[model samples]
Target chain A: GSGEADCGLRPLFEKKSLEDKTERELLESYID
Target chain B: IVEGSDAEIGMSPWQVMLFRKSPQELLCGASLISDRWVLTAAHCLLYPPWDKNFTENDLLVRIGKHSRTRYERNIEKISMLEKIYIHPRYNWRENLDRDIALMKLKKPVAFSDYIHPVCLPDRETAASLLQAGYKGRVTGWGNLKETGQPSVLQVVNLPIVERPVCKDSTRIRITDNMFCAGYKPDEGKRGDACEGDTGGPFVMKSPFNNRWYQMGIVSWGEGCDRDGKYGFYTHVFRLKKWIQKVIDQFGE
Candidate 1:
């Protein structure tokens, strides 16, 4: 009953650009 | 954990980390509620949004884990997931309403000084502790900017924010099933739950019992400690009946 619905704001960890980055890099990038 | 400080080992016995294994990635945090049950955000289970194929077998639950990288001997216990129950009402598209889930482990874990379950709040305790200005401690292995992904678990003390104040602070719709916590950006406070902290416990200590009780589940927010944005959590008390029903039906 729960799949692929837009929540307006992007879900955290949805960014594909950070997919190539290391965990550390991805964690740092979240600190906006 | 966002701008939170490091927590000592065994400080949060009920805290657990949820990981999706292929290459092994930390997905979110969770709270151990029973020997075989852990409570987490439904969004964590429905991750990637597009992929509805992720199954219970893909999840790994690590309890008594204090550090992200190191596995302390005799202190940590890892269990595979046997079942996952996402709340039927959960709809992230609908402002993340009813964002809660129950996870059943393949095997029951033994209780230890460093591993145990946190109490679920009763109506009286909820009434007293759910008020604005009442502080609760949120623990997780999420992120600490100074050290990247924190090696140790982190904790931050945050007061419950009034509903009207929370509504005015953020543009996100604050549903009845959700509540807000954390300092207003203008308060100059640094603590908040962050990206990796989803499904983690937001707990308050009962004055009468002196035991910790989970009051909230880390759900979502605009960003980690960003200006004008406050962290939102699944109000555990509001969904106590659903949680109890699941535990009653599936718990062993």
Candidate 2:
């Protein structure tokens, strides 16, 4: 029961912008 | 390996690094408890691309890489996530309570002298760790001065802060499932996990076997090291049942 439905999951990166960015793109925006 | 020039071989071999392979970014710290599973904080997997519906390919687990960048001979093994399991009761709104999580690897790790799994403590050990006058050590690549990430891993000796004392100091409800540990900050002398340190192991030498046992997972705190501020971690002993259940389903 550790699947998606079994957890209280949500997007820490919610913007539609995140889907298009690489990990660096998102993390730079996040940390900086 | 206890907070100096990169850990020597056979020192903290279970240390892991969580990487976002897309941009080749290092995210958080984790510990390998078994060949197939790495334990970390739920918040580490609750961010950006990961915050959404995540899959096995979303993250990579790097084992035995103390330098974080400089790779040596047979010192590093990168593995993918097969299935990620977060605590059902994890609550960001509640200040990262139950912040523990488990990552099942797509392939089993090849353990070596420089890379191995940490021992998990039983209930008795967990309860004993909670008794008065005890302390532990934590290591990570967090921040040298509570700022930028370091290339070499960092280690610090953090004395355990009493639960009630921690509650009073932080002015937060110190739940039974959570515990606090850190140094009493003085000018130029502070020992606690910072930003980059999230999800790393908070280990103590087990009285049972005299070997290191992971007592907690670096979870959250108000900030890095500051006067009177202690780092909060997800107490491992309290979640033994949940951990055992997940590991059991994997057939050992």
Candidate 3:
């Protein structure tokens, strides 16, 4: 078992409303 | 009265800047919700350079400002993020659903014309605001064009578009948790929230009190000012329970 206990911040770290960059990586990411 | 020009000073009193660890570098735009609470996009809390798992120490918020690089005397207020409340179901990989988050200020701030909270709406009003032809305004310091970010805040008005009209013709499977906004065909793609404008407010002027009610958050969209694409916002009415749930936890 991967033993990294789930810190409460994990979910927040995962989702974003948008990304800062325009290229995806085309700079890819979230809300912006 | 706020539009795509330089936002009038003190007009966007709830407007704020989310700074990274350094107070000089602005990371995103945000809105003051209460004396100690701020509303922002969850993704503003995450980015490329920062590690996915972030701490409260990673951010500071500056309130009462129309300029990102300049400050008005006796108007600006800064606060460290003491705690953050991201929606429990926020999913980064699959969708930008439930993109909203709230932060607790290290302490409460005194309200002023240049630093007041934006009103939040109930389900009844939120639905009314979403009706087609209703105007909702967004404010931020985002990119003006392909150009870099503006020092002064910019405001724009976008008409609320029906969800099916947006999702069907646009061919994007946006959920009900999100709402859409766009320029009228005659308006010629005049306004949109762009990069660096994340976490800002998409508000409606409420007839109830003449106060602007925060109806939508600047959530996401495809391009800076794409003609056909509509700016998508996280619908606050859908998340009122989630917001209250997290807020209640702060009491303990």
- The models' CA-based lDDT, in order, is 0.77, 0.70, 0.71
Q: Pick the candidate with the highest lDDT.
A: 1
For residues B32-128, what per-residue lDDT tens digits would candidate 3 score against the true structure? 8777888898888853345655579988888988777876778898898889888878766555788999898888888765677776776666755
Query: Considering summed lDDT, which 10 consecutive residues are worst modelled in model 3 chain B?
Result: B46-55
Off by over 4 Å in 2: A1-32, B1-6, B47-53, B185-189
Clash pairs detected, candidate 2: A13-B48, B1-B7, B3-B155
Q: Which stretches of candidate 3 lie over 4 Å from their true place?
A: A1-32, B1-3, B47-51, B169-171, B184-189
For candidate 2, the per-residue lDDT at B37 reads 82
Q: lDDT of model 2 at residue A20?
A: 14
lDDT of 2 at B216: 86
Tell me the lDDT of model 2 at B79.
91
Candidate 1 residue lDDT tens string, B1-252: 777777754567788899988778998999888788889999888844566435898879888887789978887999999899999889867588999999999998887756777788889988877887777788888876423688888888887788998899877678888999888766777678887889999987655545567889999987687676678999999999898888887776
Q: What DockQ would candidate 1 receive versus the native complex?
A: 0.02
State the lDDT of candidate 2 residue by residue for A1-32, as single tens digits.
12212111112221112221222321232133
